[PDB]
Amino acid sequence: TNHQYAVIAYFYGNASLQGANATINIWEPNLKNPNGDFSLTQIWISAGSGSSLNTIEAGWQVYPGRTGDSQPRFFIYWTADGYTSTGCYDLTCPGFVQTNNYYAIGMALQPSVYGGQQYELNESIQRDPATGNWWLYLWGTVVGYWPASIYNSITNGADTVEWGGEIYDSSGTGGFHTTTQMGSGHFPTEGYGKASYVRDLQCVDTYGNVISPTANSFQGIAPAPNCYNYQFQQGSSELYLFYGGPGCQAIAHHHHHH
Ligand SMILES: *[C@@H]1O[C@H](CO)[C@@H](O[C@@H]2O[C@H](CO)[C@@H](O[C@@H]3O[C@H](CO[C@H]4O[C@H](CO)[C@@H](O)[C@H](O[C@H]5O[C@H](CO)[C@@H](O)[C@H](O)[C@@H]5O)[C@@H]4O)[C@@H](O)[C@H](O[C@H]4O[C@H](CO)[C@@H](O)[C@H](O)[C@@H]4O)[C@@H]3O)[C@H](O)[C@H]2NC(C)=O)[C@H](O)[C@H]1NC(C)=O
Ligand SMILES: *[C@@H]1O[C@H](CO)[C@@H](O)[C@H](O)[C@H]1NC(C)=O
């Protein structure tokens, strides 16, 4: 509730996926109500549904009320009961174990420039079959793992992987009437350098083989298309998911009855 999305989903059918990748374009989207709003782009690696839902989450987030500033920051999240009483951001609760401190969890990232310099958050996650732990690698460098000890439905692998943007509307319009930007703050039709994207839309099967689904095998979700949208774009070497938008204007208030 009060969350809005522009994401794609890969439903595998059974909880057997042994990992996934996400190369996420980094931006510093503006927030209409920064004291409560957030804007992020991430991967969701999951198994189950309802209270049995288990997540492995990683990406960037502009959340001033949590991080202290408007910079996009590397964040992680997990849940083992579909967000009722388990899971937390970064290392705020026992769950994720950091083994390599080369990268800081929560590190401020360099935002991309509109029509200019493009930056990328390359994150790779893979389950270790000998333990059930899910390891995180940022730009090839190991960070740590989500232990199998905190999970139930995802202990043997994931059934669903999702990528894309999400905003959190603290104004209570449901994400339907807030100029809190998603991605770059521009609609995906703008393309490279102007609209944000997610590439390396890959996941791993039980045999360690990378699955790179085509646009045909992904389910697009964007319940507020006037505010935030998604768009596949075939690049020279791989499929791109463009996503985001400027948000929507407030509901017209032209009454002036005395
Ligand atoms: C896109 O996503 C793919 C995901 O697969 C990325 O490529 C892979 O990245 C990971 C992480 O960097 C690499 O993992 C490492 O693999 C090595 C080698 O593993 C092989 O050899 C082992 C023996 O030396 C063997 O045990 C392994 O076999 C097991 O797993 C296979 C699954 O393929 C299964 O079939 C077998 O039955 C076995 O159970 C395997 O053949 C491994 O040694 C590394 O281990 C270190 O890290 C782990 C934690 O992650 C830790 O537990 C270990 O103790 C150790 O410290 C590690 O797992 C993988 O090799 C890459 N694959 C390829 C083909 O390159 C890719 O990088 C992503 N791209 C982007 C852009 O993000
Ligand atoms: C799980 O999914 C894989 C891939 O579709 C399939 O081959 C396998 O038979 C499924 N069933 C079981 C019991 O794992």
Numbering used by the authors: 132 to 380, 401 to 409
Relevant lines from the article:
Neprosin from the pitcher plant is a reported prolyl endopeptidase. Here, we produce recombinant neprosin and its mutants, and find that full-length neprosin is a zymogen, which is self-activated at gastric pH by the release of an all-β pro-domain via a pH-switch mechanism featuring a lysine plug. The catalytic domain is an atypical 7+8-stranded β-sandwich with an extended active-site cleft containing an unprecedented pair of catalytic glutamates. Neprosin efficiently degrades both gliadin and the 33-mer in vitro under gastric conditions and is reversibly inactivated at pH > 5.
The final refined model of the derivative complex was used to solve the native pro-neprosin structure by molecular replacement. Moreover, mature neprosin produced two different monoclinic crystal forms, I and II, whose structures were likewise solved by molecular replacement. The structure of mature neprosin crystal form I proved practically identical to the equivalent part of the zymogen, with a core root mean square deviation (RMSD) of 0.62 Å. The only significant difference was encountered at N232–Y233, which is folded outward in the zymogen to accommodate I103 at the beginning of the rightmost strand of the PD. Moreover, in the structures of mature neprosin crystal forms I and II, the C-terminal segment, which spanned an alanine–isoleucine–alanine tripeptide followed by the His6-tag, ran along the surface of a symmetry mate, thus mimicking a product complex. Both crystal forms were monoclinic but with different cell constants, which resulted in variable crystal packing. Even so, the C-terminal tag penetrates the cleft in a similar manner in both crystallographic arrangements but is shifted by three positions, so that H404–H409 from crystal form I overlaps A401–H406 from crystal form II. Indeed, we found a striking pair of glutamate residues (E188 and E297) bridged by a solvent molecule pinching the bound peptides in the product complexes. Our results suggest that the mature neprosin structures mimic upstream product complexes collectively occupying subsites S6 to S1′, with the two catalytic glutamates plus the bridging solvent molecule poised for reaction.
